[PDB]
Each structure stands twice: as C-alpha cells, then as structure tokens.
Design a protein around this ligand. Structure first.
Ligand SMILES: CC[N+](CC)(CC)Cc1ccccc1
Ligand SMILES: [Mg+2]
Ligand SMILES: [Mg+2]
Ligand SMILES: [Mg+2]
Length: 340
C-alpha cells in the first residue's frame, strides 16, 4: 500500500505492473557490474544494491527487450544513479574542478566510448562500457541521436551544479524545461527503440501523437519523482524539484506545493490516456500491408506500450527503493549508499 499523499488510484487500477522475465538474472548481473566496475564500494553493494531496485525499475519499463539490450540499459541506468550521487557529492563538497573534468570526460566518452573502456576514472570507464554496448544494437544514426541527447543532459547537470553552488532555485517554467533534460526524457525515449528492435524514422517518432505520448510518460515520471523525492531533497539542500520552485517563487506552503505537484502528476495520466488512443491509431495506420509497415506498426505499438509501463514502474519504484527512505538514515543529508 502507498501513503495517501503519494497514492494514485488511476495507476493502481488502470496501469497494472509488468515485469520482464530476465529480471532475476538482471538483478545479479547489474549488481556484479557495479562491483566489478568499482562504481560502489563492495560493502555498500552487498548492503544496499538490491534494495535500491534499479534493475526492477528498468525491468518494469522496457518489456519485450532482448535480454542483452535490457542488461545494457540496466547497467547504464545504475551508472546514471551513481552519477547523480557523484554530482550531488561534488556540489556538497565544492569540488568544482573535479566536476568540470568529469563533465568533459563524459562528453568525450559519449562520442568515443570504446576509447574510454579502461579509463583511470572508474565512473567514466563504467559509462563507456554501458554506452559502447548500447551503440551495438541499432545503426549509427541511432547512436548519434543518443549522443546528441546525452550531451544536452550533461550540460543540464552542469547547469544544476551552477544553480546549487550559486544558491539559485529555478523558476517554475525554467525548472520544467530543465527537468526534461536532467531527467533525461529523450534518452529513455530513445531507448524504447533498441528494446523493440527497430530504429524509428524521423517521420514516425516525430508524429505529434508519438511525441506527445512520449513526453507525457516522462513528465509523469519526473514529477512523480519530484513528489516522492522531495523529503530527501529538502534534507540534502537539493534545489531542483517542482515543489521547491513552487514554494520559492509562488510562496506556497509545503502542503500546498505537494498538492499542486500531485495534481500536475494526476493530469499527466489522463492526458496520456487521451493521446495514447491517437498514438495507437497511428500505429494501426502504419500497418499498410507491407513488411516494413508491419515492422513499424509493431514497433510503435510496443514503444507506446512501454511508455505506459513507465507509469507503473516509476510509481512502484518510489515506494520500494531504499533510495528515498530518508527517515531511516543517521544523517538525513547523506544517504548511506552514497560515497561521502
Ligand atoms: C537520478 C535518477 N534519474 C535516473 C537515473 C536521473 C535521470 C531519474 C529517475 C529517478 C527515479 C526513477 C526513474 C528515473
Ligand atoms: Mg538526485
Ligand atoms: Mg539529479
Ligand atoms: Mg528527485
């Protein structure tokens, strides 16, 4: 059961959870990867990794993915969690130089991951290993789009570094634009395609129904994260959160901001339900009787189905993962799974 302040009855009633059959092997393989790439200390891997539920999150999202595709996605996603932790710790400890150098190496490794597989910085080497594997599934045109999207994500993280160092809370609209990048909306959307085995042509993925369904899936996920991660983020002096922007710039109380974020999250669901009908009609239209048409139709249908799965996976992840359980920590500002 979910606390009433975080409960979304429409998710529970209309978005039933799904789990990829590879999940049991995925859980252990990603844990071993985190250990072997030295992305987390061995004792913290053993104590916390399974409880963090990072593989559960992805195995509830990219249904139908080939096992090796899901493995690369899960490793990359766990890396992404550790990177968020490193970014936070660099801010907290004022390591502007270390952040800047890491930022530059990630930009370079993103374009040439093979060159960085054995880099002295284990965080860079881990990134490169996952990215090189992601680059082996689809044509180089997809790889170039992934890279373009992630260069933008890195710079959004750099903007967050500047905001927190300068004591700046973004305005609400500024935040919503930034959040599409710090949450990596377009990366998760890109990764639908290797999961269904097909790079979608620009004309297909830029169709308004596909774009809008993809957007709303990610807006829900990011703002639901904001709702559930607000306590940990307040305790950690994090400033990036829709609720924090509302409190700071619209002078809402903590209770008023929670209610406002909740209402915006709820609206994402029913806006998605409306556009999902249009997106599945588009999927039907692509089935024009040709082989390629059947392939594109099936791929769009699978991707839209996983856009829907993201709602339930993200919902339950926030209640299962130890990442957000600030009430259990000795130091509310320092999560125990983080390298401080
Ligand atoms: C730091 C976490 N994350 C993914 C690694 C950054 C993009 C957002 C996220 C949080 C919770 C669920 C799903 C994604
Ligand atoms: Mg964070
Ligand atoms: Mg973050
Ligand atoms: Mg958060």
């Amino acid at each position: 059961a979910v606390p009433p302040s975080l409960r979304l009855p429409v998710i529970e009633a209309a978005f039933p959870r799904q789990l990829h059959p590879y999940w049991p092997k995925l859980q252990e393989t990603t844990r071993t990867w985190l250990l072997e790439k030295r992305l987390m200390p061995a004792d913290k891997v053993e104590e916390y990794a399974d409880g963090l539920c990072y593989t559960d999150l992805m195995a509830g999202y990219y249904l139908g993915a080939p096992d090796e595709v899901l493995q690369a996605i899960a490793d990359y996603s766990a890396w992404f969690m550790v990177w968020d932790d490193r970014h936070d710790r660099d801010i907290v400890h004022g390591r502007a130089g270390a952040w800047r150098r890491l930022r530059g190496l990630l930009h370079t490794a993103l374009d040439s991951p093979g060159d960085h597989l054995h880099h002295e910085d284990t965080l860079v080497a881990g990134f490169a290993d996952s990215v090189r594997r992601l680059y082996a599934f689809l044509p180089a045109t997809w790889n170039a789009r992934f890279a373009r999207h992630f260069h933008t994500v890195i710079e959004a993280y750099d903007r967050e570094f500047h905001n927190r160092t300068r004591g700046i809370v973004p305005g609400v609209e500024e935040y919503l634009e930034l959040r599409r990048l710090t949450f990596a909306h377009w990366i998760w959307t890109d990764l639908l395609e290797p999961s269904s085995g097909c790079e979608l042509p620009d004309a297909v993925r830029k169709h308004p129904a596909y774009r809008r369904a993809a957007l709303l899936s990610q807006e829900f996920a990011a703002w639901y994260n904001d709702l559930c991660s607000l306590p940990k983020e307040i305790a950690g002096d994090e400033v990036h959160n829709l609720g924090i922007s509302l409190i700071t710039h619209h002078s809402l109380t903590l209770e008023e901001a929670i209610g406002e974020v909740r209402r915006r999250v709820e609206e994402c669901i029913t806006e998605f339900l409306a556009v999902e009908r249009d997106a599945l009609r588009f999927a039907d239209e692509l089935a024009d009787g040709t082989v390629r048409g059947k392939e594109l139709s099936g791929a769009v249908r699978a991707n839209v189905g996983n856009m829907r799965n993201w709602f339930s996976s993200v919902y339950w992840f926030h209640h299962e993962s130890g990442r957000y359980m600030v009430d259990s920590w000795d130091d509310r500002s320092t999560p125990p799974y983080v390298n401080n």
